[PDB]
Design a protein around this nucleic acid. Structure first.
Lengths: 393, 67, 77, 203, 80
RNA sequence: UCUGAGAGUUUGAUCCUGGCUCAGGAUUAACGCUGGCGGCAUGCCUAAUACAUGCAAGUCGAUCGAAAGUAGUAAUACUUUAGAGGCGAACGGGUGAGUAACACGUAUCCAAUCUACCUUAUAAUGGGGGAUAACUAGUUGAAAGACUAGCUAAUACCGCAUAAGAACUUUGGUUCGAAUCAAAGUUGAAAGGACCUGCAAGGGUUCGUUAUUUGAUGAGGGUGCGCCAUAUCAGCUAGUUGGUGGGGUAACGGCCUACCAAGGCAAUGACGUGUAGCUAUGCUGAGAAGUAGAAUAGCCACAAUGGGACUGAGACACGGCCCAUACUCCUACGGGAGGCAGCAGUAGGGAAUUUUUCACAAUGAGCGAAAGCUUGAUGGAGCAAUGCCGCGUGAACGAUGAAGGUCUUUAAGAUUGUAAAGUUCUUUUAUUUGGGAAGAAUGACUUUAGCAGGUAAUGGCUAGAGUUUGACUGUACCAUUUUGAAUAAGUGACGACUAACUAUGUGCCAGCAGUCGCGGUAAUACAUAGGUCGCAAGCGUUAUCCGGAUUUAUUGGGCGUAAAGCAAGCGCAGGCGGAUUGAAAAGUCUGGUGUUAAAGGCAGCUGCUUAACAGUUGUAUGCAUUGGAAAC
RNA sequence: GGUCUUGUAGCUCAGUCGGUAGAGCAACGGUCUGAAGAACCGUGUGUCGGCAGUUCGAUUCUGCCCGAGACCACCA
């Protein structure tokens, strides 16, 4: 057996906000560290953040890391999404497909503009009732400062409208959690006890045909190419007739393997992180930003009409508004598409506010799903985020 | 893919050619120019059809058109 | 691999050590006769190579070949 | 190709009737001008041996509907035996199913006949069909199927289709037979053998 | 098997019971298509005993028609 | 009796030589372009490149020690073999890198060859002994592994005996580089099991064993033969040629050793060169032949490279072992692993090449008494318009003719076009519902009866039963089985060559562009629009093998003017020979003998609703022989 | 997925401590021409790749992206 990964609890695609290396990455490590001590499907991590050349020593990561960490209470698709120069694309577009979001804040390393962008977008796509954990409490003097930092992080969340004082700030030291003190174990345990409450596990029905945000690809030794991503809807099953959708022409294909992070799945239901070896494909054929689907389904598109309310500059817009020759990037779950600009009538520039009904074509045929709360940024600043409205070519 | 370089015919009205790009050759003799022997296809590996060859669709890359 | 070329070696290595010892015990007899050209060593090597020509350790073909060539020599008298 | 879709068009060009004459008689002054956008007054000046053999092939097959490779393999099948096999092959051609159905007084239409055979509503010697390409012997029995032996369409078709004297049918039973080897006189005196028979050695 | 798939066929042949079929064979003995097992046998049955008198071992398949030859009832004279 | 079509293409125009093109099929085909089915078949040109995984050869306690364990109170029963020991491991699949050869094939001999295992024929299975793997202890290091010792089995090792026979020496006798035989000497077999029987004694069955001795089989060799280009390749050759003495093979061989002689080969072509698996065969032609040796079959090779060696019946062995190694990989740094040309699968490459697919049902291979078990052999299933076959995309009625393209530009008239609409109908398939395959009528297995020496039956021979074997399948196949015209044409070309024209634009540009050739501003050669004409789930592109090309001419060509008779002559060899005689009788042909595979051809048919095909029956070539001949 | 590099007139390219659109050919009136060359000037076009501040300004400074040109991440 390939340690076929068992599902004995509804899976949730979670993610994390704040900024890496503040204890964020070390939280991703330590929560697992304490896990295999007292948890099933819950292995221990110390330094397994990484699987790539050149990525080890730098301490600031380019790529995101999809892993599986469970408990007796919840399994998590835990994704180490970097927020970094040229790398915040890793975290930004992640906020959509992470069905949950744990805010990691450091008792050593202050909230960054990274955390601000993260919370901004998390509200913009729309996810309610976050939880936050104070990381890196390994240095003393946290009894009362954890009150002022608490009020300022609640101020931080209240810039967009999640739960406020109803969400709790669990304190804890990832260092004294990675090391293994039981009183300090209790810190991550209170983290958990306040996570599973005020965070649900989204049950996505397994009957919709299929859709997958593609995250990475590998062409494994001697069998061929495996492609990993997050299942959006429905199951993926035997030899399944599939078509790679989005950004490209349409390809039908038949599978040749499946895992959840090198751990096989007996049924890749909706919401699963599926890595499928295919019948005769290549990694070069599949990039970040692509989609998949069981056919008879959404097809690629370029043109559309978009009723959208625009992020003001205070919501992180551009220092100056955007015209029609403008070329923004619309955030379609896996990709940031440079598209045209044809705002609705009665809008030549979309000033702060301005719930517009823009119409835009995209450079590549992308499978468009109505209601997809996709986002828009440019220059490193967010101007649009909302659901799809009118399907065009 | 071998070390041999050859002249060939830009097929028809126009071109979709990018000057250091790869495509496929083609048979056909041209009696308008001497010492020339070869043809090369459009709509292939970089190029994009003979456009509006609305009476012919084979080997152009011009698909079976819609009405 | 296979189950039975590995144990084949495991079994035959010692039997072939035995072959080495035995066939040497007869090559020495060959030498001795090349000095002891007489009916004694003839019968001696006869009896002995009887074991091996019967076996595969000698062939009746090569056994007869050698013994005939040797009895030809001893026919000198 | 399988099905033509329009035959009077073909006559327009060919000036020939799949029937005796009645393919084009009068539809408000029937007018057999060849089809298209290029001829009303323009008379024959482009006929060739090549073109005449073309035309003869057409006339033959345009009445008989024989696609390329099947026609060729019919030719080749009959090639194997020895003799003045021309009339033989022609009879065999007629011993095509749809041909016999048309000539049975039961199919007023070869387009009927072949359609009906490919649906297989005709009950034969120990076996049904869905393929209109079987060959008969002089004296081979044919029967309908109860499914269709009541259809007013069928009852008028069996009432009147093209008939050969060398085939018979008890309409009382609707059951008939390809009775005997017919004669060339019993066959359309229009088509030429020499051309096509010499034409066919191409492979 | 020979013949088109969904219609196997097997000519009946004398070949070594060690080297491949369609290899070199001893002799061919008629043919019975294994599709219908009613009868298609057109065997010589002479060269068979010719082989048998100086050593041969058939396959279990042939023991059927060997019973239909009662091959014992004739080769026992040799063993007699 | 077979059986062969030509078109044009050099000018002012003709005739003639010639080429040149065209006009066909063939493909492992690939491209575009789109693409229903059903069947049939096939599916890395590339790198004998790299390669995760599984699979691709195991069997055998009824061969055993021991081990372990179970039930049983125990006694014992019973199980599982890590170990021993035996067979299979040299089958097979891939691959053809490679080689110019005895290779391939053919004829052949092997007075010079071997052939474990059946078959023929029997001589028998007497006496011991020693032994350890295992197991154990301890060493050894992470491992790789290694190392030391305590205890055993066997049909596992050595002698003891006999040895029909057999093998040899030795004298005699046999016969047309040999045998039959008379006589002396030498020398050699195993092992037990089970099962029955019998108190036992002893027998009997049977597993197995030992030898003779057939067969049969292969293997090996030899040879003529015939089996590419290369004379812008002529001297070549030193176990080399010949002889001995010896080694020596399975056996013959300088095959090798020594030793002794110098020899052996050649233009009727060595050597040299490039290429290369072969053969049946595959397509094209009327054929000779070309054409290739897709696929497959049989001979041979090859397993990463280069070496070794056992092993047995067999390797220097494609999933053996060892060596130097390529290079990847592992390690701790001390050491190692590996070799898909087994399967799919991947990577590279390419223009590219199906599933990391199921079945022991059947065939089979093996081993196993017996059950058995395997079996990326085998059968299947699946992708693919890759080929081929069959077959769709409705049947009739139904018009001075719907609209409308399109023209004419006449305002008509037509085309489009029974094609339409509209009706009657139609259901293979789309689509129901179910029935429901054989293949298994094998074969084990237990009985049944009968048979048979043995009688004391076991055990061995014939017939019945059923135990029962399926990936296929559910499908195949069927069910006036539902609904439902519903469920379904693209493609090319239209100057001549050679089928297929109206319009626009446009004017040697754009461009067409197999050939002659169309464009320099009224294009039946550009493009599009319409129409015509072509095929059709295909249609075109391209490639090449050949047809045509008799376009080297044995068939089936010439050499005056379209190259073409070397200046001439002598000129060996060679080629080519007057007549009647004879003999021989090579060829020559005939007659007979066997061989020349399968497959496939060709023809006969059975089954393919018709199919492709598959089978089915024979067919023929030549070789080699026997028998003539007298014609040459 | 970003980056290393490309974006200018008709093509390509220039862009005073930014000042515009500037070079070569296209390009055609007029010369010639057995006919047309080659050959002589004409021409002209210019949002300087697409968006964002910006001085007598963002084409040059930059921010973002797009795509043409190279790399970093299968994978001990």
């Amino acid at each position: 057996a390939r340690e076929k990964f068992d599902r004995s609890k509804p899976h949730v695609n979670v993610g994390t906000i704040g900024h890496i290396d503040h204890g964020k990455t070390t939280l991703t490590a330590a929560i697992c560290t304490v896990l295999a001590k007292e948890g099933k499907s819950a292995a221990t991590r110390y330094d397994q953040i990484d699987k790539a050349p050149e990525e080890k020593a730098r301490g600031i990561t380019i790529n995101s890391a999809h892993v599986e960490y469970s408990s007796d209470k919840r399994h998590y698709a835990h994704v180490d999404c970097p927020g970094h120069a040229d790398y915040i694309k890793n975290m930004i577009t992640g906020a959509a497909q992470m069905d949950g979001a744990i805010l990691v804040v450091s008792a050593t390393d202050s909230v960054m503009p990274q955390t601000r962008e993260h919370i901004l977008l998390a509200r913009q796509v729309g996810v309610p009732r976050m939880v936050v954990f104070l990381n890196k409490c390994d240095i003393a003097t946290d009894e009362e400062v954890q009150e002022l930092v608490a009020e300022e992080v609640r101020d931080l969340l209240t810039s967009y409208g999640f739960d406020g004082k109803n969400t709790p700030i669990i304190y804890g030291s990832a260092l004294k959690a990675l090391e293994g003190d039981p009183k300090w174990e209790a810190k991550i345990h209170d983290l958990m006890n306040a996570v599973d409450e005020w965070i649900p596990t989204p049950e996505r029905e397994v009957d919709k045909p299929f859709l997958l945000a593609i995250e990475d690809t590998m062409t494994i030794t001697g069998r061929g190419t495996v492609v990993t991503g997050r299942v959006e809807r429905g199951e993926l099953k035997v030899g399944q007739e599939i078509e790679i959708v989005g950004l490209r022409p349409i390809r039908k294909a038949v599978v040749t393997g499946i895992e959840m992070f090198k751990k096989e799945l007996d049924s890749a239901m909706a919401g699963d992180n599926a890595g499928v070896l295919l019948r005769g494909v290549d990694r070069k054929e599949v990039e970040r930003g692509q989609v998949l689907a069981k056919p008879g389904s959404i097809k690629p598109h370029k043109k559309f009409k978009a009723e959208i309310y625009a992020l003001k500059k205070e919501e992180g817009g551009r220092h100056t508004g955007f015209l029609n020759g403008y070329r923004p990037q619309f955030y379609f779950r896996t990709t940031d598409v440079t598209g045209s600009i044809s705002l609705p009538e009665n809008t030549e520039m979309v000033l702060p506010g301005d719930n517009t009904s823009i119409t835009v074509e995209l450079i590549a045929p992308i499978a468009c799903e109505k209601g997809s709360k996709f986002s828009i940024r440019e220059g490193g600043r967010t101007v649009g985020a909302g659901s799809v409205t009118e399907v065009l070519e | 893919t071998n070390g041999f370089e050859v002249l060939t015919y830009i097929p028809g009205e126009g071109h979709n050619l990018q000057e250091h790009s790869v495509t496929l050759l083609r048979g056909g003799r041209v009696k308008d120019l001497p010492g020339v022997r070869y043809h090369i296809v459009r709509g292939t590996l970089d190029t994009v059809g003979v456009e509006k060859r609305r009476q012919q669709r084979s080997a152009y890359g011009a698909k079976k058109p819609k009405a | 691999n296979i189950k039975s070329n590995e144990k084949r070696l495991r079994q035959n290595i010692k039997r072939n050590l035995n072959n080495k010892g035995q066939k040497t015990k007869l090559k020495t007899n060959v030498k001795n006769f090349h000095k002891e050209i007489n009916l004694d060593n003839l019968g001696n090597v006869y009896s002995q190579a009887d074991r091996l020509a019967r076996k595969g350790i000698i062939s009746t073909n090569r056994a007869r070949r050698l013994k005939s060539r040797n009895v030809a020599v001893l026919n000198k008298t | 190709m399988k099905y033509t879709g329009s035959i009077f068009k073909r006559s327009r060009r060919l000036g020939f009737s799949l029937l005796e004459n009645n393919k084009e008689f009068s539809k408000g002054k029937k007018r057999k001008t060849i089809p298209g956008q290029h001829g009303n007054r323009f008379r024959s000046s482009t006929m060739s041996g090549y073109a005449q053999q073309l035309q003869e092939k057409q006339r033959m097959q345009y009445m008989y509907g024989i696609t390329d490779k099947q026609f060729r393999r019919l030719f080749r099948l009959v090639l194997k035996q020895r003799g003045n096999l021309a009339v033989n092959l022609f009879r065999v051609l007629e011993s095509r199913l749809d041909n016999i159905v048309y000539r049975m007084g039961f199919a007023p239409t070869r387009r009927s006949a072949r359609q009906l055979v490919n649906h297989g509503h005709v009950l034969l010697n120990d076996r049904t069909v869905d393929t209109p390409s079987i060959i008969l012997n002089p004296g081979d029995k044919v029967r309908l199927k109860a499914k269709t032996i009541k259809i007013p369409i069928v009852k008028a078709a069996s009432e009147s289709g093209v008939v050969s004297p060398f085939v018979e049918t008890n309409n009382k039973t609707f059951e008939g037979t390809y009775v005997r080897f017919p004669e060339r006189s019993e066959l359309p005196a229009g088509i030429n053998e020499s051309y096509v028979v010499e034409w066919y050695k191409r492979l | 098997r020979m013949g088109r798939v969904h219609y196997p066929t097997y000519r009946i042949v004398a070949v070594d019971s060690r080297v491949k079929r369609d290899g070199k064979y001893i002799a061919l003995i008629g043919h019975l298509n294994p599709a219908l097992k009613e009868n298609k046998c057109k065997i010589d049955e002479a060269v068979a005993l010719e082989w048998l008198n100086k050593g041969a071992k058939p396959t279990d398949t042939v023991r059927s028609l060997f019973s239909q030859t009662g091959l014992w009832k004739k080769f026992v004279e040799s063993k007699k």
